[PDB]
Amino acid sequence: MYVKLISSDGHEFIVKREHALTSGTIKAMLSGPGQFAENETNEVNFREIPSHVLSKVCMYFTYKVRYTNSSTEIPEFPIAPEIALELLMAANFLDC
């Protein structure tokens, strides 16, 4: 129930599988030949996504999954101005 979102640098962002299927592209990568359970966690390679943005992506996964169907007013996801453009292209590619 854990997946290892390896970034381009080599950082192995081990996030829960329920969180990773928030993004459509990761759900597609974990389907087909990519669902082969190598080790216990499925190593997803992201050779085009750096670590400083994949960390924000995983934080968004654990934020949306926790804050889904929230009764209280939901706080906005904090995206720094220097990361915003690179996290924009990572949000489109990952379809999250």
Partner 1 sequence: DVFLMIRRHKTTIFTDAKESSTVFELKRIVEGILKRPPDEQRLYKDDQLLDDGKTLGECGFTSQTARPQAPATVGLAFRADDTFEALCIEPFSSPPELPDVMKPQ
Partner 2 sequence: EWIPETLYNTAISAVVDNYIRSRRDIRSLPENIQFDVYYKLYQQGRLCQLGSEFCELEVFAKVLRALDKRHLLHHCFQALMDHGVKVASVLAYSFSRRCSYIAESDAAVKEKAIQVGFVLGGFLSDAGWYSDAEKVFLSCLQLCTLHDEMLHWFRAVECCVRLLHVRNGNCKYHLGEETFKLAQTYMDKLSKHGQQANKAALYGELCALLFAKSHYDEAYKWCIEAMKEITAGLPVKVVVDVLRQASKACVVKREFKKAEQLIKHAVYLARDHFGSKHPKYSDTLLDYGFYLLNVDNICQSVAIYQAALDIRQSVFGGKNIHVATAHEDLAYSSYVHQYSSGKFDNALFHAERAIGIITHILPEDHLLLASSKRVKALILEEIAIDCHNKETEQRLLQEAHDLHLSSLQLAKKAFGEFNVQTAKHYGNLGRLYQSMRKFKEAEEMHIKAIQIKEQLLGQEDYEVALSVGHLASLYNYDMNQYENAEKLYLRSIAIGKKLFGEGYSGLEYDYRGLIKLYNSIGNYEKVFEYHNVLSNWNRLRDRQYSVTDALEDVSTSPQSTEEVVQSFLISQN
Q: Does 81 bind partner 1 (CB under 8 A)?
A: yes
The pair of three-digit structure tokens given for residue 47, joined into one six-digit string = 């050779």
Minimum distance, C-beta of residue 87 to partner 2, in the bound complex (Å): 5
Q: How far are the Cα atoms of 11, 30, 32, 70 from residue 77, in angstroms, in the given order?
A: 22, 26, 32, 14
* CB of 80 closer than 8 Å to CB of 43: no
**x/- track of binding to partner 1 for residues 1-30 (CB under 8 A):** -x-x----xxxxxxxx--x-----------
Q: Does 41 bind partner 1 (CB under 8 A)?
A: yes
Q: Does 32 bind partner 1 (CB under 8 A)?
A: no
